[PDB]
């Protein structure tokens, strides 16, 4: 932190402070993330420097010096959480929602093709720029560092986007967990409200069940044998997506339903989702960004 001049706190991320900083040698403005605390993690994280795609926030460097771990990322000026808050009177226009979803699916398809999962997608790690791009930040890190209940400064890590197999204690994640999260985000962009804003693991799980119906062996073979499944769960009926995400059209609702299948083996893949009729008329609009 002397071969970075000018260093400012951006926010508090899942693993430590995030700073905006200028690289000394190069003049470039970067995001610098301090990871608060392991050699297995270093090689794993290091591999992510090769995982480069236009819809993935570039990992520029892994700095392991002075027994500290810093990740240096490409810097973007706004996140989707802030953008949706700024867009709340009018909503994000459907063509821009569509562009963002399509781009995010391209990013997921890339990473999934290389056997890399995110596992903690949320609006705060989706970053936007002035050119209409959106990018996924922090891919691959959960496999390396875990996902805590609370961050270094005691902020509660959100459960809102967590897939039901994770909440039911399945110990092997698949790429389907990212599709679920993205489906949740899609619904939130459309309705301007989080889809499942749980404030505890059971509240999260029951909010899912009260919308999508309590899962059973018909819709999710194997569910009743999951580690944290209890036969005493209340049995709620499923709601129609026409009630959950109006005014989304039938193409959008169909796609959302497939992203929110209970059984992770039934849930649509990113690559398949890109071929969905919802994207037949996709475009790349310019967002209105105030920086
Ligand atoms: C991995 N990675 C993170 C980023 N950037 C961000 O996190 C980021 C930074 C800032 C920011 C605001 C005022 C002054 C300085 C910075 N505002 C937002 C709003 C949303 N994100 N964000 C770039 N790369």
Numbering used by the authors: 1 to 37, 45 to 298
The authors write:
To further demonstrate biological relevance, each pool of four or five compounds was screened against a representative protein target (cyclin dependent kinase 2, CDK2) by SPR at three concentrations (2.5, 20, and 200 μM). The kinase domain has been structurally well characterized with the orthosteric ATP-binding pocket sitting between the N- and C-lobes in which many small molecule hits have been shown to bind. Other allosteric binding sites have also been identified with small molecule and fragment screening at sites with potential biological relevance in the development of inhibitors with allosteric modes of action.
Thirteen screening pools from the library were identified as potential hits, having Rmax between 31 and 102 RU and KD values for the pool between 87 and 270 μM. For example, pool 9h–l had a projected KD and Rmax of 112 μM and 98.7 RU, respectively. 11 of the 13 triaged pools were taken into crystallographic soaking experiments with the exemplar protein CDK2. A positive hit was identified in crystallographic experiments from compound pool 9h–l. The compound containing the methylpyrazole carboxamide substituent (9k) was the only compound to match the electron density of the 2Fo – Fc map. Analysis of the X-ray structure showed that this compound shows a novel pharmacophore, with the methylpyrazole group embedded toward the back of the orthosteric pocket forming a hydrogen bond network with the backbones of Glu-81 and Leu-83 and π-stacking with Tyr-19. The NH of the amide linker interacts with the hinge via the carbonyl of Leu-83, with the expected acceptor interaction with the hinge instead forming between Asn-3 and a nitrogen in the phenylpyrazolo[1,5-α]pyrimidine ring. The phenylpyrazolo[1,5-α]pyrimidine interacts with the backbone carbonyl of His-84 and NH of Asp-86 resulting in rotation of this core scaffold relative to the methylpyrazole, orientating the phenyl ring toward the top of the opening to interact with the side chain of Glu-8 via van der Waals forces. Reduced density, however, was observed for the phenyl group most likely due to its positioning at the opening of the pocket where it is solvent exposed. Eleven of these were taken into crystallographic soaking experiments, resulting in the elucidation of a novel hit for CDK2.
